[PDB]
Amino acid sequence: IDLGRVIGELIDHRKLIISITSVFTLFAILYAL
Amino acid sequence: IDLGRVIGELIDHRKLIISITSVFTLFAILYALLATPIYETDALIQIEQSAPETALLQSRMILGKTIDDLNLQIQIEQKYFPVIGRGLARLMGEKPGNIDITRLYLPDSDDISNNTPSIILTVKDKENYSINSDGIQLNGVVGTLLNEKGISLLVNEIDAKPGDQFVITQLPRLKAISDLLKSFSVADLGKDTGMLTLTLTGDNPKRISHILDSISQNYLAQNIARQAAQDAKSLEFLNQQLPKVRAELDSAEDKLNAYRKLNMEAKSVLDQIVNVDNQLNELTFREAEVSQLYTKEHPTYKALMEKRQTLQEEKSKLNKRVSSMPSTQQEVLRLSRDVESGRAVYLQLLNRQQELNIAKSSAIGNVRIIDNAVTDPNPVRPKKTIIIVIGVVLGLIVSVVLVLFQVFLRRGIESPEQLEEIGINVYASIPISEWDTLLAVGNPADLAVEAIRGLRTSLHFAMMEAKNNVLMISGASPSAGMTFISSNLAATIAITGKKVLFIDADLRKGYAHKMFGHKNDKGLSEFLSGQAAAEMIIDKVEGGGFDYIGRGQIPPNPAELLMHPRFEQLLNWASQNYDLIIIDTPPILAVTDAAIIGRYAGTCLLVARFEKNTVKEIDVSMKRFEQSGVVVKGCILNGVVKKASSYYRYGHYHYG
Amino acid sequence: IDLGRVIGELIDHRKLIISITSVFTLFAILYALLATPIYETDALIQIEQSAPETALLQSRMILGKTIDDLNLQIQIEQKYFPVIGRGLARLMGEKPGNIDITRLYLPDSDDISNNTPSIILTVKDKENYSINSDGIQLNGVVGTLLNEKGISLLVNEIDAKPGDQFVITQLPRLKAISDLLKSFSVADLGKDTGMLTLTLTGDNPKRISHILDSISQNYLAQNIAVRIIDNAVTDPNPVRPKKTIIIVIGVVLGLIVSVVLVLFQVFLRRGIESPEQLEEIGINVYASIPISEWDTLLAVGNPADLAVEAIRGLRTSLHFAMMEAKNNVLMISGASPSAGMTFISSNLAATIAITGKKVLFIDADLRKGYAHKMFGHKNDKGLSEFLSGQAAAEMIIDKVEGGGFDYIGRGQIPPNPAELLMHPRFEQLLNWASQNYDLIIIDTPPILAVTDAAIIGRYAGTCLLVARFEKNTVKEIDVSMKRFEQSGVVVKGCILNGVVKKASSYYRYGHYHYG
Ligand SMILES: Nc1ncnc2c1ncn2[C@@H]1O[C@H](COP(=O)(O)OP(=O)(O)O)[C@@H](O)[C@H]1O
Ligand SMILES: Nc1ncnc2c1ncn2[C@@H]1O[C@H](COP(=O)(O)OP(=O)(O)O)[C@@H](O)[C@H]1O
Ligand SMILES: [Mg+2]
Ligand SMILES: [Mg+2]
């Protein structure tokens, strides 16, 4: 395994990563407000 | 990896490194030059312990007393539109403005969040000014008080130039106490001695010294009160009035209860009266205690009379407002004024009762002030040098991280050994020519044309023992340089007196006719489809010396056209009338045209773009050609540039 | 790596090492000899405790009283223009001047920044003096007070030579207090006794003792409204700067930086250092020519030079290598320009000619050839004019005066050099010459730059590369060999040129005179 492979994996899975992080941040904002 | 590699990488990325370091250092400079300076003042007090005195100095009673004395709940700040206007004004040497305000009462909207009312005052001259809260514009004059629209304001000694604006906020008392407490510190410095060091930080070098002096005076006065409070009748005087004051308070409550069992202006004036009554009450009690411990001609003592004069005038005009109000609303206000003032004065008497009790138990001998507060003219914040150093070091560290990142993310070819490890002969390395014309004709002395001549002499030896005199140039990915290499190579081989035919077999995006000067009718397509003869398609390059065959009109079936036997008939015919035939083709990874053509070509070469293509793409292209029965002779690295990290030396320099 | 290598590297770079260390030591000595000396004065106080007392001594009341007593707000600075003039003046034995001023009042400009007004006084004699604030020149006399232009000033006992200048500053009271507080220290020395040691540092040995006495007296008087055991005295030996430690740090820093810089220069060299590096790859090195310290042929001007001896060695190597060659044509080329190809070729031709064989030297560097300059020339009808067809084979051959061999110069620089060399007339010329001469040596441009050498090498029986000693790398030579081989030219071997003596080499040449 190398850095290029993991970077490519993140780039490919960016849709899932962004969706999950956005959901968690949205719940955090709703609780905080 | 070794030191040479990293040094070369740094040298190559020097422009990026310098840019990043410079931008962070510029931001650090800008911050350390526009951040508002913070001065610090200190004082020294003698005590005859010192652990509870530290806590008693930071109590809300002492700080509240000093805020009421110095009137710190009136916040005045010069107006600058940007978050840097103040810094620019200071650097340009402009003298900051200041206004002395001794009386302020906003209408106290007091909504859910904005508990701090504020107005904007614009200086029109040395005497008059304009005031706006929410667009309600008013004209005021220094000296005379302004009491209009539920707003009371007294402005004295305007020191600014006309046109300046100042934000005036009336923040709550606890907010002022918290603000002062955040910046105030007490220490013993010896952990046993009777020495107290008081410290206060703030942006106004004189205001903070005045505040610290006021704190010291209040502490000294409070603690030495016991000297003459033992025989002072005020203690019993408090014990006498306090039950009595409660009596009318109960009566005031009951009468209001009886009448109860909402005019906007009435409560607006009602609160303002209540504030005026409060201001009078402690002022008299303040004026009382000042009278024994100070002199009448003392500036503090003389101050209270015009403050007392101010309050009475405000109340008098307030009484004028009430007299102009209906008695139905006036009746409620008189009950309310009695209730509010009585309740307010009751708490004050409870406060004064509690204050004098603490003086009774104060064990400290009395007080002594060794050093009155003075302010150090050299600001303590921001610390310029450390900020600058952190900025520079941060710039360097982020630059190094970014460059190392780009190094480990790089995959393109860098030097012909990468190709030669796999077993691919690299016949040339063409540099970038920074110079719709043939390079080998416009600028025959260019470096790239020299490298192409080197390729020519390599080919003249490689193409011996070839099946025929057909050379096919192809590549892995588009815009790698196949047309560039093919056309210029044809030019250089033609100038040596051999007859050359150039065929643009890129029936999809071929533009050789544009680059040669053309008769675009009857290209290769029109021949292959059968609607042209082998003689109508050959054209002469003007600045060249070789013939060409253009693609013609784009067909809908390029790959299937190239499979027609007319193509091989054309090649066999041309191979007897020319010394060399050079065929330009589309990439091999994209389409299959090159693999169809390569069956008829004696020699085939790939072109690899310098930094874009990778080793694997070239290997894959070689395999794809091989599976179709075409043997690739070798590769041509194109688009090389100078990299200090290479440690590979080309001859890409002028010699002449 | 081993110890022998690093010792050799140090011996080689000794000049740089010594220069750097010498510069650092010189700066250290100059700093330790020009920094103004700082003396320490001290006193001893007895307390009948002492924890609050250190805080009370350093209070603004005591220090303020002393400052008012001694007028320490009147700062007098003897004027030296450079940041070293005072140090030189002290070293030259010049006695520093001083002036007693007992009452001073400047108009107190008090702008945003310069809260410290200051003037300049120039001494005219023992009696009168000139004063200038901002060009306003006034004349004053010791004794009588001056009250003019918002500047009021009284001078007593000017003690200096005429022509001296002094800056007089009236700094604020708080600034003076802070300055005094910086130099003043109190310690307990027993942590339990009633003994306190008071210390004060300053540049004037007497003024600081007076100041400490004033502090002690003011303190003592204040307390009785505490006992002075030892009044203040000044140690005559300055405490700063500490000369020896400064010099030692300078020397050690110099050695450290020199060693580290040498380590970079060692780790960042890539050039060839010995023929062993080339022979690892599989390249025969036929000679190693040293640098000749001595527009003329070296093999003619100084036939006994070391470089010519090495070239004779190369000649005897060639006479054996060039047997079983397909013809008598030898081509010298190289990797990079200014490696020595023309030097080697011309001198080798000279040494082979002096043995009684007929030698022809062809300068086929049609781009930057200068052989005709170095031989004495009739520059008409070089090689270009022959190849282009406007000259015959016999008007281009010229005779070297001090040599003994013929040559063919390039002629006029053509616009198409590489295309000319492909003409068959070139091969005709070589075939004709190969029957009239014993040896033909062809000089060529580098191979990495242009392709002329690879065109010529097809007709050459033997080819040799020339590599400069320290400049070229092994990679360049290997690349040049491969590029020649791709074009169908077999390179016999290499010639290392421009060697110098390196102690770190541990590889021994015979570059020394024997005779
Ligand atoms: N070494 C080079 N120096 C300067 N320009 C180049 C070089 N190689 C290619 N190019 C130019 O960049 C463009 C891409 O090359 P081109 O051959 O036309 O595309 P393709 O390889 O797909 O046929 C062209 O405009 C070409 O002239
Ligand atoms: N061993 C050497 N000793 C002294 N000078 C040398 C030596 N080798 C080359 N030179 C001189 O350094 C210069 C470069 O050599 P030269 O052969 O003329 O360049 P090029 O290799 O490109 O033909 C010349 O002036 C040459 O006389
Ligand atoms: Mg193309
Ligand atoms: Mg030369």
XYZ file of C-alpha atoms in Angstrom, chain C:
515
model
C 33.064 5.894 4.224
C 36.215 5.700 6.343
C 38.430 8.016 8.351
C 41.018 8.281 5.587
C 38.443 9.744 3.216
C 37.274 12.419 5.645
C 40.826 13.367 6.603
C 41.637 13.737 2.922
C 38.569 15.901 2.385
C 39.587 18.158 5.259
C 43.124 18.450 3.906
C 41.740 19.340 0.476
C 39.351 21.981 1.823
C 41.861 23.321 4.365
C 41.944 26.689 2.598
C 38.197 27.224 2.957
C 38.184 25.859 6.507
C 40.975 28.177 7.625
C 39.439 31.188 5.891
C 36.038 30.697 7.528
C 37.448 30.037 10.992
C 39.750 33.044 10.665
C 36.848 35.324 9.733
C 34.780 34.121 12.677
C 37.690 34.527 15.088
C 38.405 38.020 13.781
C 34.803 39.085 14.351
C 34.877 37.562 17.833
C 38.049 39.456 18.732
C 36.725 42.729 17.332
C 33.528 42.369 19.346
C 35.422 41.475 22.514
C 37.735 44.455 22.001
C 35.185 47.104 20.994
C 32.143 46.356 23.161
C 31.853 48.990 25.865
C 32.971 47.633 29.249
C 30.414 47.265 32.023
C 31.413 47.617 35.672
C 29.650 46.359 38.785
C 29.320 48.216 42.074
C 27.863 46.783 45.237
C 26.896 47.540 48.818
C 25.840 45.613 51.917
C 22.758 46.451 54.007
C 21.661 44.984 57.345
C 18.001 44.449 58.264
C 17.010 44.064 61.913
C 12.187 39.830 57.209
C 13.733 41.082 53.933
C 11.117 39.454 51.707
C 9.048 42.645 51.231
C 12.203 44.680 51.406
C 13.473 43.750 47.955
C 10.107 44.907 46.626
C 10.293 48.174 48.539
C 13.822 48.976 47.345
C 12.804 48.597 43.696
C 9.730 50.771 44.183
C 9.243 53.918 42.163
C 9.386 56.147 45.249
C 12.984 55.366 46.245
C 14.323 55.298 42.701
C 12.403 58.446 41.840
C 13.910 60.240 44.809
C 17.427 59.221 43.791
C 16.787 60.249 40.189
C 15.555 63.672 41.244
C 18.557 64.053 43.548
C 21.160 63.119 40.934
C 19.391 64.566 37.862
C 19.605 61.205 36.148
C 17.058 62.451 33.604
C 19.795 64.524 31.927
C 21.474 61.988 29.661
C 24.850 63.026 28.243
C 26.350 60.996 25.403
C 29.785 61.665 23.952
C 29.412 61.739 20.175
C 31.168 59.190 17.979
C 29.806 58.870 14.456
C 30.256 55.092 13.930
C 29.030 52.186 16.020
C 32.707 51.577 16.791
C 34.163 55.069 17.223
C 33.868 54.891 21.002
C 35.684 51.559 21.065
C 38.559 52.858 18.959
C 38.781 56.037 21.022
C 39.038 53.962 24.186
C 41.629 51.673 22.603
C 43.622 54.637 21.300
C 43.962 55.756 24.921
C 41.842 58.858 24.375
C 40.421 60.190 27.630
C 36.613 60.446 27.411
C 35.202 63.912 27.878
C 32.462 64.787 30.330
C 30.306 67.802 31.163
C 28.531 68.724 34.385
C 25.018 70.025 33.749
C 23.032 70.934 36.836
C 19.840 72.361 35.339
C 18.273 71.720 31.932
C 14.918 72.403 30.257
C 14.113 71.701 26.600
C 10.939 73.047 24.940
C 9.470 69.509 25.092
C 8.347 68.941 21.510
C 6.503 65.804 22.698
C 5.261 64.502 19.358
C 3.614 61.096 18.916
C 6.834 59.071 19.193
C 9.841 61.235 20.147
C 8.939 61.971 23.748
C 12.679 62.480 24.389
C 13.848 65.904 23.195
C 17.562 66.140 22.518
C 20.145 68.688 21.389
C 23.797 68.663 20.334
C 26.522 70.668 22.066
C 29.880 71.318 20.403
C 32.799 72.358 22.594
C 34.634 75.457 21.368
C 36.944 76.005 24.352
C 37.068 75.538 28.108
C 34.520 78.368 28.436
C 32.030 78.737 25.570
C 30.127 76.202 23.500
C 27.659 75.945 20.637
C 24.183 74.436 20.915
C 21.943 73.190 18.115
C 18.554 71.493 18.352
C 17.208 71.623 14.779
C 19.715 73.978 13.184
C 19.081 76.744 15.734
C 22.671 77.649 16.617
C 23.276 79.396 19.932
C 26.397 80.267 21.907
C 26.633 79.704 25.646
C 29.212 80.044 28.399
C 29.988 77.800 31.367
C 28.770 79.520 34.506
C 26.111 81.936 33.290
C 22.749 80.304 32.638
C 21.022 80.455 29.252
C 17.292 81.150 28.774
C 16.600 81.456 25.032
C 14.098 80.135 22.484
C 12.287 77.919 24.970
C 15.635 76.270 25.733
C 17.109 76.857 29.162
C 20.416 75.348 30.124
C 23.270 75.649 32.620
C 26.753 74.140 32.131
C 29.521 73.713 34.708
C 33.089 72.389 34.225
C 33.340 71.310 30.622
C 36.149 68.730 30.768
C 37.073 67.788 27.196
C 39.103 69.010 24.276
C 37.704 71.576 21.820
C 35.880 70.217 18.797
C 34.062 67.473 20.703
C 30.323 66.939 20.341
C 27.820 65.649 22.891
C 24.184 64.612 22.628
C 22.098 65.955 25.508
C 18.764 64.205 26.009
C 16.008 65.129 28.454
C 14.260 61.793 28.760
C 11.079 61.395 30.820
C 11.183 60.523 34.494
C 9.580 57.105 34.040
C 12.080 56.209 31.329
C 14.962 57.038 33.656
C 13.361 55.027 36.457
C 12.944 52.005 34.203
C 16.515 52.303 32.938
C 17.844 52.420 36.488
C 15.632 49.507 37.509
C 17.054 47.385 34.698
C 20.593 47.701 36.064
C 19.737 47.347 39.764
C 19.498 44.078 41.672
C 18.921 42.993 45.266
C 19.817 39.625 46.763
C 19.644 37.999 50.185
C 22.909 35.958 50.141
C 21.823 33.894 53.134
C 18.091 33.398 52.554
C 17.680 33.992 56.303
C 20.009 36.786 57.443
C 19.155 40.448 57.678
C 21.902 40.943 55.107
C 21.038 42.257 51.653
C 23.517 42.741 48.831
C 22.693 45.598 46.470
C 24.217 45.499 43.005
C 24.305 48.023 40.183
C 25.882 47.731 36.742
C 26.893 50.564 34.457
C 29.517 51.957 32.145
C 30.876 54.785 34.304
C 32.776 53.348 37.288
C 32.196 56.349 39.570
C 28.682 57.392 38.610
C 27.244 53.982 39.453
C 28.847 53.997 42.896
C 27.405 57.452 43.526
C 23.982 56.248 42.399
C 24.088 53.230 44.689
C 25.131 55.437 47.593
C 22.195 57.729 46.871
C 19.825 54.760 46.776
C 21.120 53.471 50.098
C 20.877 56.886 51.750
C 17.353 57.545 50.474
C 16.238 54.109 51.624
C 17.837 54.491 55.046
C 16.376 57.955 55.580
C 12.917 56.840 54.483
C 12.884 53.870 56.855
C 13.699 55.889 59.980
C 10.714 58.140 59.301
C 17.970 49.132 58.161
C 21.699 49.715 58.486
C 24.428 50.474 55.941
C 27.295 48.093 56.637
C 29.226 48.486 53.377
C 28.843 51.564 51.236
C 28.944 51.069 47.494
C 32.255 50.395 45.778
C 33.024 49.596 42.153
C 35.005 46.556 41.093
C 37.691 47.872 38.697
C 37.560 44.702 36.575
C 34.628 44.917 34.135
C 32.142 42.073 34.283
C 31.034 42.333 30.639
C 31.944 41.562 27.970
C 33.608 38.303 29.025
C 36.398 38.265 26.466
C 37.740 34.723 26.678
C 34.382 32.981 26.471
C 33.413 35.150 23.483
C 36.612 34.237 21.660
C 36.227 30.534 22.444
C 32.632 30.527 21.211
C 33.743 32.305 18.051
C 36.443 29.744 17.302
C 34.195 26.768 18.024
C 31.401 28.212 15.894
C 33.842 28.760 13.045
C 35.040 25.175 13.169
C 31.487 23.826 13.325
C 30.257 25.846 10.357
C 33.370 25.037 8.321
C 33.004 21.312 8.932
C 29.295 21.328 8.104
C 29.844 23.327 4.914
C 32.559 20.889 3.861
C 30.146 18.030 4.493
C 27.615 19.604 2.145
C 30.237 20.145 -0.542
C 31.325 16.513 -0.217
C 27.795 15.148 -0.343
C 26.811 17.361 -3.291
C 29.600 16.511 -5.743
C 28.733 14.209 -8.618
C 31.630 14.628 -11.036
C 34.103 11.942 -11.951
C 36.963 11.595 -9.498
C 39.021 8.613 -10.647
C 39.113 6.277 -13.644
C 37.756 3.573 -11.364
C 34.301 5.117 -11.595
C 34.356 4.814 -15.373
C 35.832 1.324 -15.273
C 33.062 0.099 -12.989
C 30.666 0.745 -15.863
C 32.933 -1.037 -18.316
C 34.646 1.853 -20.082
C 38.352 1.617 -20.826
C 40.196 4.746 -19.733
C 43.235 5.034 -21.958
C 44.909 7.976 -20.233
C 44.549 10.645 -17.581
C 45.827 14.086 -18.566
C 46.565 16.594 -15.782
C 45.978 20.327 -15.862
C 48.861 22.153 -17.524
C 49.546 25.370 -15.630
C 51.859 26.613 -18.382
C 47.130 30.324 -29.101
C 50.042 27.906 -29.333
C 50.347 24.146 -29.155
C 51.400 23.058 -25.686
C 53.143 20.082 -27.277
C 55.298 22.644 -29.102
C 55.742 25.504 -26.654
C 56.689 23.362 -23.648
C 57.412 19.835 -24.902
C 58.530 18.726 -21.427
C 55.260 19.526 -19.678
C 53.526 16.890 -17.588
C 50.425 16.988 -19.767
C 52.492 16.284 -22.854
C 54.056 13.319 -21.061
C 50.606 11.934 -20.320
C 49.679 12.496 -23.950
C 52.738 10.512 -25.031
C 51.484 7.706 -22.829
C 48.169 7.938 -24.646
C 50.053 7.794 -27.939
C 51.688 4.508 -27.033
C 48.342 3.138 -25.863
C 46.753 4.063 -29.185
C 49.524 2.569 -31.286
C 48.484 -0.786 -29.826
C 44.721 -0.273 -29.625
C 44.399 1.021 -33.177
C 45.809 -2.167 -34.667
C 43.177 -4.282 -36.422
C 41.175 -1.126 -37.066
C 39.288 -0.983 -40.338
C 41.259 2.114 -41.372
C 43.638 4.750 -40.026
C 40.995 7.309 -39.002
C 40.638 8.314 -35.357
C 37.816 10.510 -34.078
C 37.928 12.334 -30.755
C 34.625 13.488 -29.316
C 33.100 14.174 -25.940
C 29.999 14.588 -23.851
C 29.925 18.307 -23.040
C 31.601 21.365 -24.559
C 34.935 22.654 -23.286
C 35.943 19.208 -22.091
C 39.225 19.206 -23.972
C 38.556 17.526 -27.294
C 40.406 20.142 -29.321
C 43.239 20.273 -26.795
C 43.663 16.500 -26.773
C 43.328 16.116 -30.526
C 45.763 18.859 -31.481
C 48.417 17.882 -28.959
C 48.098 14.191 -29.783
C 48.589 15.031 -33.442
C 51.709 17.017 -32.578
C 53.238 14.204 -30.544
C 52.462 11.609 -33.186
C 53.943 13.854 -35.858
C 57.252 14.343 -34.062
C 57.870 10.595 -34.410
C 58.197 10.868 -38.180
C 54.708 9.833 -39.292
C 52.511 11.886 -41.598
C 49.476 13.176 -39.715
C 46.358 14.946 -40.982
C 44.178 16.881 -38.542
C 40.626 17.672 -39.668
C 38.672 20.245 -37.669
C 35.142 18.998 -38.266
C 33.642 21.310 -35.644
C 31.784 23.390 -38.204
C 30.077 25.373 -35.478
C 32.724 26.669 -33.055
C 36.039 25.453 -34.466
C 39.066 27.671 -33.880
C 41.950 25.406 -34.897
C 43.066 27.716 -37.695
C 43.472 30.469 -35.106
C 45.692 28.248 -32.985
C 47.787 27.058 -35.938
C 48.283 30.215 -37.986
C 45.970 30.196 -40.935
C 44.862 30.948 -44.433
C 41.207 30.821 -43.386
C 39.966 30.683 -46.976
C 38.743 27.310 -48.228
C 38.113 25.359 -45.059
C 36.092 22.181 -44.836
C 32.797 23.958 -45.524
C 33.907 25.256 -48.904
C 34.949 21.746 -49.896
C 31.756 20.046 -48.744
C 29.511 22.632 -50.385
C 31.395 21.940 -53.619
C 33.190 25.259 -54.175
C 36.726 23.985 -53.519
C 38.892 21.028 -54.473
C 40.688 18.684 -52.111
C 44.099 20.320 -52.521
C 43.440 23.981 -51.723
C 42.092 23.153 -48.260
C 45.143 21.363 -46.817
C 47.472 23.656 -44.888
C 50.767 23.103 -43.072
C 51.210 23.770 -39.363
C 54.281 25.919 -38.787
C 55.582 24.669 -35.445
C 54.014 21.223 -35.819
C 54.884 18.908 -38.675
C 51.395 17.820 -39.632
C 48.813 19.166 -42.057
C 45.358 20.356 -41.133
C 42.021 21.235 -42.679
C 40.222 24.110 -41.013
C 36.477 24.430 -40.847
C 36.201 27.467 -43.090
C 33.135 29.684 -43.048
C 30.424 28.649 -40.615
C 27.667 27.195 -42.787
C 23.958 27.528 -42.004
C 23.397 23.753 -42.288
C 26.371 22.031 -40.656
C 24.874 18.608 -39.975
C 23.405 18.328 -43.461
C 26.745 19.126 -45.090
C 28.525 16.270 -43.334
C 26.088 13.802 -44.887
C 27.319 14.646 -48.373
C 29.284 11.819 -50.049
C 32.125 14.244 -50.774
C 33.134 13.865 -47.127
C 33.662 10.130 -47.482
C 35.472 10.750 -50.757
C 37.804 13.129 -48.931
C 38.544 10.623 -46.187
C 39.138 7.822 -48.683
C 41.562 10.014 -50.604
C 43.404 11.157 -47.484
C 43.671 7.671 -46.007
C 46.072 6.724 -48.803
C 48.340 9.763 -48.456
C 48.774 9.902 -44.672
C 49.710 7.616 -41.816
C 47.055 8.889 -39.410
C 43.957 11.082 -39.606
C 42.537 12.711 -36.480
C 39.102 14.325 -36.642
C 37.887 16.801 -34.048
C 34.139 16.984 -33.518
C 31.546 18.869 -31.487
C 30.070 17.226 -28.390
C 27.593 14.431 -28.896
C 24.993 15.461 -26.338
C 24.628 18.875 -27.959
C 24.507 18.132 -31.682
C 24.656 15.031 -33.870
C 27.667 15.829 -36.059
C 29.946 13.373 -34.282
C 27.548 10.499 -34.906
C 27.474 11.328 -38.605
C 31.260 11.431 -38.830
C 31.839 8.308 -36.752
C 30.522 6.054 -39.496
C 33.735 6.628 -41.455
C 36.125 6.518 -38.496
C 38.009 3.364 -37.623
C 38.386 4.350 -33.974
C 36.434 6.679 -31.692
C 37.375 7.979 -28.254
C 35.478 10.125 -25.778
C 37.009 12.848 -23.621
C 35.613 13.454 -20.149
C 36.579 16.431 -18.013
C 37.793 15.374 -14.592
C 35.497 17.143 -12.188
C 32.748 18.522 -14.436
C 31.179 15.575 -16.240
C 29.450 12.753 -14.397
C 29.441 9.024 -14.981
C 25.857 9.308 -16.186
C 26.760 11.747 -18.961
C 29.535 9.518 -20.259
C 27.333 6.436 -20.194
C 24.568 8.296 -22.026
C 27.041 9.505 -24.639
C 28.334 5.985 -25.204
C 24.810 4.650 -25.630
C 23.852 7.443 -28.010
C 26.889 6.688 -30.142
C 26.052 2.991 -30.163
C 22.464 3.601 -31.267
C 23.756 5.342 -34.375
C 26.025 2.429 -35.210
C 29.340 3.805 -33.945
C 31.463 1.742 -31.567
C 33.355 3.798 -28.999
C 36.697 2.265 -28.114
C 37.154 4.043 -24.807
C 37.489 7.210 -22.802
C 40.153 9.758 -21.873
C 39.983 11.524 -18.530
C 41.179 15.109 -18.815
C 41.968 17.970 -16.484
C 42.984 16.071 -13.363
C 44.309 17.859 -10.275
C 45.947 16.591 -7.097
C 43.467 15.558 -4.404
C 44.605 14.143 -1.082
C 41.223 12.462 -0.589
C 41.586 10.530 -3.852
C 43.914 7.794 -2.570
C 44.463 7.055 -6.278
C 47.966 7.828 -7.513
C 48.825 9.259 -10.923
C 52.341 9.839 -12.111
C 51.829 13.585 -12.479
C 55.215 14.667 -11.176
C 58.402 15.733 -12.894
C 61.058 13.059 -13.400
C 64.347 14.295 -14.819
